Symmetry: none
Subunit: 109 residues, 2 copies
């Protein structure tokens, strides 16, 4: 199998972030996050390079910076800050139970 | 030797949680957290066996359940929920960039 555990993203609660993750996966980005926290700041620097801030929005990355699959080439979308920060808190809290190296499949229904 | 980085615990901001951590280090519980996130549910179930929830309080563990050092034998104390949840958010944010296996020395100050 290609993953160790599954996370069901709460798209009804964070619909804008959920739409991005679902679209990114539809455009071929991995649906699995192989957790790697050490490289996360550097991946984010590489994914967000040359992408200016849009007031009222944050720059959402899929795959995420905390995944081996993130960084160069990741899909970036401006997402309303309330939605994206709520989503970021949800994901951070959910991934906090998983060790580095664990492969998490994300499902956005 | 025994740690990779140092986290200064902000006992002036979270004084009940800080008092517990300090008291438990003086009772010989490790001041180093070897981060290990996958076992945290199982460790917490071992440390808190027979200790029920109490509205207004959270059950604080030292060593923490997200540390190899936690689980059976940990010091447990009921701490006011606002103090403890503040501490947990602060500690969780400060540790989120460290991969599993990272040894963090805590100094309560």
């Amino acid at each position: 199998a290609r993953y160790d555990d599954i996370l069901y993203f709460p798209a009804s609660r964070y619909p804008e972030t959920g739409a991005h993750i679902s679209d990114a996966i539809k455009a071929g980005h991995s649906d699995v996050c192989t957790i790697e926290r050490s490289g996360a700041d550097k991946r984010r620097q590489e994914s967000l390079k040359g992408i200016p801030t849009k007031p009222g929005f944050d720059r959402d990355e899929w795959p995420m910076a905390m995944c081996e699959e993130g960084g160069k080439g990741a899909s970036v979308r401006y997402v309303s800050s309330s939605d994206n920060r709520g989503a970021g808190s949800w994901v951070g809290n959910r991934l906090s139970g998983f060790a580095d190296g664990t492969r998490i499949l994300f499902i956005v229904q």
